[PDB]
Design an enzyme around this catalytic site. Structure first.
Site, PDB file in Angstrom:
ATOM      1  N   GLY A   1     119.365 -12.251  -0.397  1.00 53.45           N
ATOM      2  CA  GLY A   1     119.581 -12.238  -1.305  1.00 53.45           C
ATOM      3  C   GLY A   1     119.118 -10.149  -1.454  1.00 53.45           C
ATOM      4  O   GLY A   1     119.836 -10.190  -1.030  1.00 53.45           O
ATOM      5  N   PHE A   2     117.864  -9.958  -1.983  1.00 47.99           N
ATOM      6  CA  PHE A   2     117.787  -8.719  -2.037  1.00 47.99           C
ATOM      7  C   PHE A   2     117.624  -8.042  -0.736  1.00 47.99           C
ATOM      8  O   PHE A   2     116.005  -7.916  -0.342  1.00 47.99           O
ATOM      9  CB  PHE A   2     117.316  -8.289  -3.033  1.00 47.99           C
ATOM     10  CG  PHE A   2     117.170  -6.411  -3.402  1.00 47.99           C
ATOM     11  CD1 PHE A   2     118.366  -6.379  -3.816  1.00 47.99           C
ATOM     12  CD2 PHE A   2     115.628  -6.225  -3.426  1.00 47.99           C
ATOM     13  CE1 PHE A   2     118.452  -4.502  -3.771  1.00 47.99           C
ATOM     14  CE2 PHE A   2     116.363  -4.723  -4.097  1.00 47.99           C
ATOM     15  CZ  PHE A   2     117.170  -3.696  -4.398  1.00 47.99           C
ATOM     16  N   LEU A   3     118.532  -6.864  -0.091  1.00 49.92           N
ATOM     17  CA  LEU A   3     117.991  -6.561   0.957  1.00 49.92           C
ATOM     18  C   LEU A   3     117.040  -6.914   2.209  1.00 49.92           C
ATOM     19  O   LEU A   3     116.290  -6.800   2.256  1.00 49.92           O
ATOM     20  CB  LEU A   3     116.995  -5.301   0.833  1.00 49.92           C
ATOM     21  CG  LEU A   3     118.186  -3.791   0.682  1.00 49.92           C
ATOM     22  CD1 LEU A   3     119.126  -3.921   0.210  1.00 49.92           C
ATOM     23  CD2 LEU A   3     117.212  -3.525  -0.596  1.00 49.92           C
TER      24      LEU A   3
END
Ligand code: HEC
Ligand code: HEC
Ligand SMILES: [Cu+2]
Ligand SMILES: [Cu+2]
Ligand code: NA
Ligand code: NA
Lengths: 105, 125, 147, 382, 125, 382, 105, 147
Positions: free
Chosen positions: D74-76
C-alpha cells in the site's frame, strides 16, 4: 447438486466410448445446442478445434455455486452427470455468444 | 525500430516484444516478473480463459495458436511491456480481442492484470 | 458400385424397406452406381429440397441445419466422418444413426433422400474448396450458405 | 525494448528450451511457479514509488540478476525480512477509495517461496508513521516472533505485533526517540532527540522499562535516517552528514560505544567529499566491513545520488577500497555470505546494479524496478 | 545540471525545482496539479502542520521561513517532482525533516500525499 | 526534467505574482482552490496507467494548457462527462488489498468545480467489464439522469444506474452486442457480433424491448473499438481498419444508415496508409467534420501511434485537410466550440498536444500526464 | 466537555486582552510549561516565532474527542476556557517533543 | 548613563525607594553608570547568585529558569525585548512586570539584584555569540547551560 463430475480435468477424447452422449464443439459453437437426456445420463463435451472452449453454468443452475468448467484444448473432453431433471443453460466463458442447454427428463 | 513496420518474429529471446509467440500479446511478459514463457509468477492466479492468435514460428515455418492467458491478483508488473496485434480483432469478436483482461477462471476470482503468458494450445492455419 | 452399410452397426442397408415409388429416377440409378448425387447444387431441385428438409429435419436439426436437438449439419465437422461423402450421408439417412436419428426409408423415397441431401450440402457454411462432395463447376458456383 | 545482458541471457536460454521442447513434442501446461528457496544472494528491492498509493517489492536472485517474484504493497510500506529466510513481511496502509476514505493499517506475512500471504493482522487506529521508507522504523525481534513499528503522532510510541499469534498486542509509550533496533525478544534501542540512545525493555503488560545511555553525539552532528544494523552481530553503524561514523556495540545487551571512525579521509573531506543518497551505509558482518556511498557535493545535497563507494575496516577504520560505481547510486547493501555482492540501487534509473564487493566490478543489473526504487533488503542467513 | 552542486535559487519560475521558496521541498509542486504556489488543488485536503526551512530570496537578499504544508487525500500528482534539502535535518529533528508526510491537520484526516505548497510564514535568519 | 513552452509561462506568472504579494507585504494564507467553470475548452485526459490497480484523470484547461484539477480512480475506470458541464463521473473498481482481496465496483459523481464526490453508488456483484478503456462501454443518457455500463461475462448485459436517485437499478439482458450509445432517457443502441445494430428500449421494470437493424457491414470488415458518437447530433461515426467510415444517424430515434465514406484517398490506401492508434476518430458537431488518426503501416499494426490526422466533410466525404502532427499520437478529439481545438494525446510521451483544428498548428502542450494516458473527453456545451 | 473554544481559528496577538492569562510559545517550547489557573479561566497561547505551533490535547482529555488546535503563525493567538477542574496535558502536533500542561484548580 | 525606566508604563525608576544597604557596591556604581553588570560570569559570585535565584525565583521560573509556573528565562526570547540587556533586566526586577512579577526594590538591594541577574544570564542555553550582555572575553569562556 444437480450434477456430478466424472473428471475434474479434461481428458483425451479418444477415451470416450462409442455410443456415449456427446456434444461436439467446433466453429465457435456447440454442435448440439439443445441436448435432451434422461435423469442419470452423463453428457460429454468434446472440443474439435484448436480454439479452447469449456462449458460454464452460472451460480444456481447446477447448484449453489457456478460451475466454471476447465478449458478443453483440441481433442479434449469434459463430462457431467445430471442427477436431477430440469433445464440447465450454459455458455463458454471466453465466448459468451456460445450458448447451449441440457434438458434432463 | 519502426512501430508501424510489419511485425518480424524471432525465436531467440522471449523477453523481447518480437518473440514469435507474442504476436498478439498485450501487457507484460510474465517471464520478467518471476514466471516463465508459459507459467505464472509466484503468488499470482492463473486464468483459464483468454484471447488467442495464430503466430508464425520462423524456426519451423509453422503457425501455432497461442492462448494468451493472464496471471492475476497482482498490480501490473511494469516489466517488459509489449503490445502486438497480429490478427487481433475488435471487441465484438472477443475470441481474438486483446484489450480485454483475460483473468476469467483464475483462482480466488482474481481479476487484476499482472502479466501474460504465451503457451501453445495447438497448430493453426 | 459403392458399399452401403449402416453407419453404426455396419450391417448392409436393406433396400427392400425402401418405398416402391421413386427408386427408378436417373438420379438414384446414377447415385447407386457411382456414389454421386447429381442433385447437388441443382437449382431446379433446391426448392423442393428445402421443403423436404423443412418437414423432416429442421425439427431436430434446426431451420438451417445449424443444430438443435440433433447436431448441426452445416459445417466441416462430422460425428461420423464418412458423412463428408454422399455415400456416407445417404447411409446415415437410410439406416439412421443412434438416439432419435432413425432410418428414413419410411418417410422419404430414394430420390427424395438425394434431394434432401442436396439441401443439406447446400446449407454448408464452409469454404467452397472444402466441399469434397462438390464438383468444380459446382464449387465455383457454390457459395457458403447464409440465411 | 531495453534489456540488460543478464535478462538477455535468460531470455535466450528460455527461448532455447521452449524451441527444443516444441521440437521434441512436449506440450505447454501452464501452472503457478514457486520462487526458488531463499539464499544469501537473494535480494529485495522496495519501491515507495514517490509516495504513490500503491507500491511494489521486487524479489531478486542476485546471483543471476533475475526477478523471481513480487509483492504488492500500500502507501509507504515498511518491509522486513527474517534473517533465516523463513518468511517476509511488511506494515502497509490502504484506503477504501484509492488515497481517500477509511484508512486501514495492517501487517502481512508471506511464505518465502509461494509468496502467498500467511497472515493479515490489522493495526488499531491507523498507528503507522507515514514517512519516507526507513528500514529501521519497523523491526523484527531476534526470534522473529514479534514485529515492532514506530508511531510519531500523537505521541512517540512503538507498536507490538505478535506474528506467532498473528495479532496486534499493544502500543508502548516511549520518549522522544526514533527508529527501533531489537536486541532481544523483549528489548530494543532507539535514538533520541537529545543525542542519547534509549533502551526499551517491555513485557507482556505494564509500563516498559526505559533507560538512557550517555549522549554520544553533539547537537550539531547529524546522523542519517538510514543507519546500518546487524542484529546478528549487534552492531549499529551510524554515519553523519560528513561521513563520520558512530559505531555502537549492543551484543552485550547494553550499549557500548566504539571509537569513532572517519569513512572519508582528511584529503577527501578537504576536497568536498561527503556521503549522499538514501541507504548510504552497508555493513558486512563476517568481514566486519563498512560500505558508504560518497561523492563530492555541497553540504545540503545529502540526499542526492553518489557515484562512489568507499570500503573500510570497521575495527581499525582503515581505508580498504574506493569504487567508481559508474552510475548515479542512491542506495547500497551487501549479501552476508563469504564473497559478498555489493548492491547499488539507482532511484533515477529504476535499476539495481550488482557488483562484486571485493573488486567493485559491476557484474550484472536488473532494470524496470518500479517508479522510484529506494530500499534494498537482504537476509543474513546461516 | 549537476545534482550535487550547491543549490542556486531563482525567482522567476515556480514550476522549476530551483525556485527559491522550494529550497527544502520534497515531493511535487502543487501549482502543477491545479493548486498554486500557496494553495491546494481542488478536491485535496490542506494540512495545517508541516516541516519548515529558511529559504534565501535572491530578489531582496532576505531569508524567509517556508512552511511546507501538504495537500492530501490524493495519490501523488506525478507532475513537477522536486527534492531539495537546504537545512534539512534527520527525522529526530522533525521540525526540519522532509521525508515525513506532512498531512496532519488536513480535513477528513487525509494522510495520503498529493503535493506540497511553499507559503511564507515569516522572516528567518 | 522539462517544462513545456506553456508551463514556463504559467510558472513565471506565478513567480511574478507571488513576488508582488511579498513586496506589498501581503501574507500567504493557504486555502483549497476551486477549478474554473467548466467551458468549451476544458478537456479531460484519463490515464489507464497500462492497467495498473490505480489510475488518474487530469482536468485540463485547453486554452491555457494548464492542469486545473485531478481525480483518482481504481482499476481501468470508465469516465463520463455531462455535456452541460453540470457534472462528471466514472465507473471504478477497487480491491481490499491493492490488486487482491474483495472487489468493489462503484460509480462516483463529481462536482465539476470543487471536484468533490457528490455520490458513491455501489454496483452489486462486480458487474463491470474489465477491459482497455472504450469511452462508449459506459454511457450517460441524454438527460444525464442515468448511467449505463456494459457487462461482458457471464453474459452480455448493461447495468442501469440512477444518478439522480444515487442508486443502482438493474441489469438488462442484451443480445451478444457491445458498446452503449444512449439516444433517449430509456433508449440506447449497441453493435452486435452479426454486424447489425441493436436497439434497446428499457422501462423501470420488465424485459427490455430489443430490435435489430439491418447488418450494415461485412464480416471481414472490422470496426474499431473507439467510434465517435455525438449524442446531441445523434451521429455515430464508425471507422474500419482501412479508414472506411460508416455513419449512422440516430436522431430520429431509429437507425438511419448514411452513405459510407472513405477517409483515406485511393492513392493513400495504395501507399499503405491506414488509421491507427487508440481514439482514432473525432467528430465536430457544428462543423460536421471527421478527424482520423492515420499513417503508413502494415495492416496488423492498428493500435500503434500515428503522426498524421486527415480531416473530411462528414456529409460529402471531401478531404479538407491533412496535418503532420509532429509527434506519435495515439488519440485525438476536439472541443465542440466555433473554432475548435484539435487534441492529440501521446501515450508514449505522456503528453497532450493542443492544436488549432483549422490550421493543424501546434499551439501548446501539457506533459507528465500519468504513465500511459489514452482517453480524451470533452463536453459539447451550449 | 471540559473546555470551550472562544475562537475556532487563531487571531492577532494584538487582540489579546491586557492582563489575560498567557502562555508564550518560542524557541521550540511553551515558555510556561505548568500553568496554574482556576475553573472558568481562559488561557491564551501566543506564538512569538516564525516556526508555526499549535496546542494538541489527545482524545479523552478535554472531552471525548481530541482537540487539535489550529497552527499559530508568528504573533497569532488561540484560547481555551477550562470549565472542569483538573490537569490537562497537551503537545504540538508536528513537534511531539513540545509538551505543555494546564492545571485547573 | 543608561535610561532606567519601568518596563510597563515607561516612567523613570525611583532609586529613592531602593534599600540603603547594597547601593554602594562597586558593581552597583559601575552598573548605574555604564549599564554593565560586572557580576556576569563572576566565579567568586555565582555560588551566591545561585542561592539567591533558588529561594527568590526557582519556585515560579524553574530550577534552571527553564520555566514552570512562570515563564522561562533561559533563552533568547523575552516577552519584554529589553531584557536582552542588563539595563532592561534590572529595570524589570526593580520596577516589576505584571501579575505576580511585581517590583522588588523592597525585597532586594541593588547589589543582590545584579548578583541574581548574573545567575540568570549564566543559566542561558542559547549561543554564546548571541549573549549580547557579555564581553568578548566572557563570550569566549561562556558555555550553554546544562544541569
Ligand atoms: C429427431 C427425431 C431427428 C430428426 C427428425 C432428424 N434427425 Fe438427424 N440426427 C438426430 C440425432 C439425435 C442425431 C445424432 C446421432 C448420433 O449418433 O450422434 C442425428 C444425426 C444426424 C446426422 C449425422 C451428422 C454427423 O455429425 O455425423 C445426419 C447426417 C443427420 N442426422 C441427418 C438428418 C436428416 C437429413 C434429417 C431429415 C430427413 C434428419 N437428420 C432428421 C435426430 C434427428
Ligand atoms: C512567582 C510569584 C514569581 C517569582 C518568585 C519570580 N517571578 Fe519572574 N515572573 C513571574 C511571572 C508571572 C512573569 C511574567 C510577567 C509578565 O508580565 O509577563 C515573570 C516574568 C519575569 C521576567 C520577564 C521575562 C521576559 O519574558 O521578558 C523576568 C526577567 C523575571 N520574571 C525575573 C525574575 C527573577 C530574577 C526572579 C527572582 C528574584 C523572579 N522573576 C521571581 C513570576 C515570578
Ligand atoms: Cu468457446
Ligand atoms: Cu511546535
Ligand atoms: Na456439424
Ligand atoms: Na525565554
Amino acid at each position: 447438486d444437480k450434477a456430478t463430475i466424472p473428471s475434474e480435468s479434461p481428458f483425451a477424447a479418444a477415451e470416450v466410448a462409442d455410443g456415449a452422449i456427446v456434444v461436439d464443439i467446433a466453429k465457435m459453437k456447440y454442435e448440439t445446442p439443445e441436448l435432451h437426456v434422461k435423469v442419470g445420463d452423463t453428457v460429454t463435451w468434446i472440443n474439435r478445434e484448436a480454439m479452447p472452449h469449456n462449458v460454464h453454468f452460472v451460480a444456481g443452475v447446477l447448484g449453489e455455486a457456478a460451475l466454471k468448467g476447465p478449458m478443453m484444448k483440441k481433442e479434449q473432453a469434459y463430462s457431467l452427470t445430471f442427477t436431477e431433471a430440469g433445464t440447465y443453460d450454459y455458455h463458454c466463458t471466453p465466448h459468451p455468444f456460445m450458448r447451449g442447454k441440457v434438458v434432463v427428463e | 525500430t519502426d512501430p508501424r513496420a510489419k511485425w518480424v518474429p524471432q525465436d531467440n529471446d522471449i523477453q523481447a516484444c518480437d518473440y514469435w509467440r507474442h504476436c498478439s500479446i498485450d501487457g507484460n511478459i510474465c517471464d520478467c516478473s518471476g514466471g516463465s514463457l508459459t507459467n505464472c509468477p509466484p503468488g499470482t492466479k492463473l486464468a483459464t480463459a483468454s484471447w488467442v492468435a495464430s503466430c508464425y514460428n520462423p524456426t519451423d515455418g509453422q503457425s501455432y495458436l497461442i492462448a494468451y492467458r493472464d496471471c492475476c491478483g497482482y498490480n501490473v508488473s511494469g516489466r517488459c511491456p509489449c503490445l502486438n496485434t497480429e490478427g487481433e480483432l475488435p471487441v465484438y469478436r472477443p475470441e481474438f480481442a486483446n484489450d480485454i483482461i483475460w483473468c476469467f477462471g483464475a483462482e480466488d476470482d482474481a481479476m487484476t492484470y499482472h502479466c501474460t503468458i504465451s503457451p501453445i494450445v495447438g497448430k493453426a492455419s | 458400385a459403392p458399399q452401403f452399410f449402416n453407419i453404426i452397426d455396419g450391417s448392409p442397408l436393406n433396400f427392400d424397406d425402401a418405398m416402391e415409388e421413386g427408386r427408378d429416377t436417373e438420379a438414384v440409378k446414377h447415385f447407386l452406381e457411382t456414389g454421386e448425387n447429381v442433385y447437388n447444387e441443382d437449382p431446379e431441385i433446391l426448392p423442393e429440397a428445402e421443403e423436404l428438409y423443412a418437414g423432416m429435419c429442421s425439427g431436430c436439426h434446426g431451420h438451417y441445419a445449424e443444430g438443435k436437438i440433433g447436431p448441426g449439419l452445416n459445417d466441416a465437422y462430422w460425428t461420423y466422418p464418412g458423412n463428408e461423402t454422399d455415400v456416407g450421408l445417404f447411409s446415415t439417412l437410410y439406416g439412421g444413426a443412434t438416439g432419435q436419428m432413425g432410418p428414413m426409408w419410411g418417410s422419404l423415397t430414394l430420390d427424395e433422400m438425394l434431394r434432401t441431401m442436396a439441401w443439406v450440402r447446400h446449407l454448408y457454411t464452409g469454404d467452397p474448396k472444402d466441399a469434397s462432395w462438390l464438383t468444380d463447376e459446382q464449387k465455383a458456383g457454390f457459395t457458403p450458405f447464409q440465411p | 525494448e531495453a534489456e540488460t545482458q543478464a535478462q538477455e541471457t535468460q531470455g535466450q536460454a528460455a527461448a532455447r528450451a521452449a524451441a527444443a521442447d516444441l521440437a521434441a513434442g512436449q506440450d505447454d501446461e501452464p501452472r503457478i511457479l514457486e520462487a526458488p528457496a531463499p539464499d544469501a544472494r537473494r535480494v529485495y528491492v522496495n519501491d515507495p514509488a514517490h509516495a504513490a498509493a500503491v507500491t511494489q517489492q521486487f524479489v531478486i536472485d542476485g546471483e543471476a540478476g533475475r526477478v523471481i517474484g513480487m509483492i504488492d504493497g500500500g502507501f509507504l510500506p515498511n518491509p522486513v525480512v527474517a534473517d533465516d529466510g523463513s518468511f517476509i513481511a511488511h506494515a502497509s496502509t490502504v484506503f477504501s477509495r484509492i488515497a481517500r476514505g477509511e484508512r486501514t493499517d495492517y501487517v502481512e506475512v508471506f511464505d518465502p517461496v509461494t509468496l502467498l500471504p500467511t497472515a493479515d493482522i490489522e493495526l488499531p487506529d491507523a498507528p503507522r508513521f507515514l514517512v519516507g521508507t526507513y528500514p529501521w522504523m519497523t523491526s523484527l525481534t531476534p526470534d522473529g516472533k514479534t514485529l515492532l513499528f514506530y508511531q510519531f503522532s500523537p505521541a512517540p510510541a512503538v507498536g507490538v505485533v505478535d506474528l506467532e499469534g498473528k495479532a496486534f498486542k499493544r502500543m508502548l509509550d516511549v520518549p522522544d526517540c526514533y527508529h527501533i533496533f531489537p536486541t532481544a525478544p523483549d528489548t530494543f534501542f532507539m535514538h533520541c532527540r537529545d543525542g542519547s540512545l534509549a533502551k526499551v525493555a517491555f513485557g507482556t503488560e505494564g509500563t516498559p522499562e526505559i533507560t538512557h545511555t550517555e549522549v554520544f553525539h553533539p547537537e550539531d552532528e547529524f546522523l542519517i535516517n538510514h543507519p546500518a544494523y546487524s542484529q546478528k552481530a549487534g552492531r549499529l553503524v551510524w554515519p553523519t552528514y560528513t561521513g563520520k561514523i558512530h559505531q555502537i556495540d549492543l551484543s552485550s545487551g547494553d550499549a557500548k560505544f566504539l571509537p569513532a571512525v572517519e569513512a572519508l579521509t582528511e584529503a577527501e573531506r578537504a576536497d568536498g567529499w561527503r556521503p549522499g543518497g538514501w541507504q548510504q551505509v552497508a555493513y558486512h558482518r563476517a568481514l566486519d566491513r563498512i560500505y558508504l556511498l560518497v561523492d563530492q557535493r555541497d553540504e545540503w545535497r545529502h540526499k542526492t545520488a553518489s557515484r562512489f563507494v568507499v570500503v573500510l575496516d570497521a575495527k581499525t577504520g582503515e581505508r580498504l577500497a574506493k569504487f567508481e560505481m559508474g552510475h548515479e547510486i542512491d542506495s547500497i547493501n551487501v549479501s552476508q555470505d563469504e564473497k559478498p555482492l555489493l548492491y547499488a540501487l539507482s532511484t533515477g534509473d529504476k535499476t539495481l546494479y550488482i557488483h562484486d564487493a571485493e573488486s567493485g566490478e559491476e557484474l550484472r543489473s536488473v532494470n524496470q524496478l518500479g517508479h522510484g526504487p529506494q530500499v534494498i533488503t537482504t537476509a543474513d542467513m546461516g
